[PDB]
């Protein structure tokens, strides 16, 4: 039953029961599956996008967005699978009413997931790629894996020119290293840490933030399907983040490298006990300042192996990289192939928008489909005392401002709550005093707050400042749960406002919701 060819292949008896699909396949059979679905193998072995699943494994929720390369499921001999429907996905689905971009990104049918056959099961006016592993890539991964198993905790530095497959390859490495279970009479799933140093288009983080993440379960989902993680079992937790308020680090190399050091430090500490490999992916530069940064990064981190995903790259960058790589006593540098729409800009924007709608708390993380406008903001005070006021002040990076401008300038943009650990941070800045005007913390220098002394507690969106008559206050909305927010005394909490690329989606969102479900909106000009 269910016969077709060229993209999938025949299955056998597909018994639909209670909303789930029990399918038996007595031969090597590969099939694509667009949508949201949980896998729970009963007998046999299945390979899904890099992770091998067997009977003794918990259910794995897989999100397969029609945008990227849809994961392929290949089953190795006579096996029986049960495909469950995903619940939380419904909440994410409803987000299409607040921005049409999320509309054309899933199965255009009725249920949550629809199997795909020869060519006509595809949605209208849209192509449909497919994840395919080159023989080289796979073989290389095998080599690294076998070496790793007979060694300690390796560090893999992945880099290469833009749109080459750095991210995809990283995904494969992470999933396979984690789930492999070779000859040990399987094991359990060995944890894996990921260091994302890509402000441009991050992973496990909102855009404009660098971070270290700890993974327990396989990572089978794009970046915009899990941006924020429960700060502090639990699947994916976030160790530490830093706010590099740009979308191109070429605005302050010093800070960037500093951040890299601090994060790697923490990694060193935790890794030391329980052996856990670290996969780090870089932004992706080749010419100019970027190349220099890559060199310095290699020097500081001292990775076990460097993978350059180009094989036909420019001679200058390859040479430079080889020199730097060779310098740190010895470092294996190997090149691998690549392969040649949604631009990075829109993808980035989607990530950001998804983050703010994350609900403040097998599943991963629910989504709250109610527009940002309708929500109730947090009312923070501004004229108190330096210990009972709320926000200690407002710092600015790479650009100053006069007093009058600040109120209008800050309002509307995205900022970051930054918690001061040790008092050695604000040493040198003329910290405001209790005393109506915004407590702007003058910073003539321009440089950002030291990473070793301060941390990011999640981005914040401002929706209104009213500092008149006798009660200076700010109305801001964040995804951060109330629990953490209350537990900080207010004295140790500064607000950092930089670039971040203005959340244009936010303003319009209210209007879209009102129109689709069925007035002097600032900054948005309607063409009448």
């Amino acid at each position: 039953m269910h016969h077709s060819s060229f993209q999938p292949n025949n299955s056998n008896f597909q018994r639909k029961a209670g909303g789930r699909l029990v399918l038996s396949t007595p031969d090597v059979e590969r099939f694509v599956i667009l949508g949201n679905y949980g896998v729970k193998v009963h007998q046999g072995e299945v390979t899904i996008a890099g992770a091998t699943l067997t009977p003794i494994d918990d259910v794995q929720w897989v999100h397969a967005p029609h945008c990227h390369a849809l994961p392929v499921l290949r089953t190795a001999n006579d096996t029986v699978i049960e495909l469950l429907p995903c619940p939380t996905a419904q909440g994410l689905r409803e987000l299409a009413r607040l921005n049409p971009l999320f509309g054309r990104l899933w199965n255009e049918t009725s249920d949550t997931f629809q199997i795909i056959y020869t060519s006509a099961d595809a949605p209208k006016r849209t192509s449909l790629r497919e994840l395919a592993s080159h023989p080289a890539w796979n073989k290389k991964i095998s080599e690294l894996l076998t070496s790793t198993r007979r060694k300690p905790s390796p560090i893999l530095f992945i880099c290469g020119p833009k749109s080459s497959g750095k991210s995809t390859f990283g995904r494969l490495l992470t999933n396979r290293l984690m789930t492999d279970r070779a000859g040990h009479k399987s094991r359990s799933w060995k944890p894996v840490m990921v260091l994302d140093l890509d402000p441009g288009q991050p992973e496990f983080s909102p855009p404009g933030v660098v971070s270290l993440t700890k993974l327990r379960r396989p990572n089978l989902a794009p970046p915009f399907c899990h941006p924020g993680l429960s700060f502090g079992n639990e699947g994916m937790t976030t160790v530490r983040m830093h706010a590099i308020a740009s979308v191109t680090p070429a605005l302050d190399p010093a800070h960037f490298i500093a951040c890299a050091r601090d994060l790697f430090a923490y990694y060193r500490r935790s890794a030391s006990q329980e052996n856990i490999p670290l996969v780090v992916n870089t932004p992706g530069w080749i010419q100019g300042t970027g190349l220099d940064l890559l060199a310095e990064l290699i020097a500081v981190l001292r990775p076990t192996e460097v993978l350059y995903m180009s094989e036909d790259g420019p001679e200058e960058t390859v040479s430079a990289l080889r020199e730097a790589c060779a310098s740190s006593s010895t470092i294996p540098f190997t090149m691998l192939p690549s392969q040649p729409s949604w631009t990075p800009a829109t993808l980035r924007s989607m990530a950001m928008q998804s983050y703010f709608h994350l609900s403040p708390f097998g599943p991963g993380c629910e989504w709250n489909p109610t527009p940002l406008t309708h929500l109730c903001p947090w009312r923070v005070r501004l004229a108190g005392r330096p210990d009972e006021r709320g926000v200690l002040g407002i710092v600015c990076y790479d650009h100053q401002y006069a007093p009058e401008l600040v109120s209008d300038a800050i309002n509307g943009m995205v900022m970051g709550l930054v918690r001061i650990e040790k008092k050695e941070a604000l040493r040198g800045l003329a910290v405001p005093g209790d005393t109506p005007l915004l407590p702007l913390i003058p910073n003539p220098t321009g440089s950002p707050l030291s990473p070793q002394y301060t941390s990011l507690v999640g981005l914040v969106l401002i929706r209104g400042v009213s500092l008149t008559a006798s009660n200076p206050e700010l109305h801001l909305l964040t995804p951060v749960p109330p629990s953490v927010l209350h537990s900080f005394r207010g004295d140790e909490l500064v607000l950092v406002a930089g670039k971040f690329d203005a959340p244009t989606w936010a303003y319009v969102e209210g209007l879209y919701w009102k129109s689709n479900s069925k007035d002097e909106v600032p900054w948005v000009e309607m063409l009448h």
């Binding site: 940002l372 406008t373 309708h374 109730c376 903001p377 947090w378 009312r379 923070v380 005070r381 108190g384 009972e388 006021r389 709320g390 926000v391 650009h399 401002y401 006069a402 401008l405 209008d408 300038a409 309002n411 509307g412 943009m413 969106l461 929706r463 209104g464 400042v465 009213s466 109305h475 109330p482 927010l485 209350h486 537990s487 900080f488 005394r489 207010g490 670039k499 690329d501 203005a502 244009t504 936010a506 303003y507 319009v508 209210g510 879209y512 129109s515 002097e520 909106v521 600032p522 900054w523 948005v524 000009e525 309607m526 063409l527 009448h528």
Partner: protein, 187 residues
């Protein structure tokens, strides 16, 4: 509903106000003082807009030119020595010309700067000055003064005139009973 164009100003009243401040002449010791004051504020404001993102090239160029002119005419131990002012002008000018020409260009291989310049209606003098200013020995103060003022007026007839007429108790979750859904920004 693709009719959504994003701007960095709050509304049309803010945009018009800035325009007024830049050109008191058409919009209309103590008098000079006040005019200078307003111009300074206007420049600052535009700078903020630039940071915010998505700002028309013409507004930027206007800001630059006014900034240079304003710096040049400043008694009180702030006349910048002479060589500085000449640089400020050269920078603003070069940026302005490069912007206009680059924008109105075709997607062929190597069409000439002069051709594009003529097609758009930009006086060949400006283009010539641009080429000279960047490579061939930074221009004299007088020439820059004249060119800057002419540039400003030209800009006015090109862009700005088409914009209208000419006349722990620190965090309290907001009360879920007295709240009303308002858009982002308004209080």
């Amino acid at each position: 509903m693709v009719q959504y164009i994003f701007t960095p100003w709050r509304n049309r009243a803010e945009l018009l106000a800035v325009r007024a401040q830049f050109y008191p002449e058409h919009t209309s010791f103590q008098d000079d003082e006040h005019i200078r004051s307003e111009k300074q504020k206007a420049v600052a404001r535009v700078s903020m807009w630039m940071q915010r993102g998505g700002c028309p090239h013409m507004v930027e160029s206007t800001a630059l030119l006014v900034a240079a002119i304003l710096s040049d005419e400043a008694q009180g131990s702030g006349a910048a020595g002479g060589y500085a002012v000449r640089a400020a002008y050269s920078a603003a000018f070069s940026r302005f010309v490069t912007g206009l020409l680059d924008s109105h260009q075709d997607k062929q291989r190597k069409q000439s700067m002069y051709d594009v310049a003529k097609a758009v209606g930009l006086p060949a003098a400006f283009v010539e000055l641009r080429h000279q200013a960047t490579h061939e020995q930074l221009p004299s103060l007088t020439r820059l003064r004249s060119a800057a003022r002419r540039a400003l007026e030209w800009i006015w007839w090109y862009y700005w005139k088409g914009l209208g007429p000419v006349d722990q108790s620190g965090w309290v979750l907001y009360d879920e009973k007295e709240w009303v859904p308002k858009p982002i920004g308004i209080v």
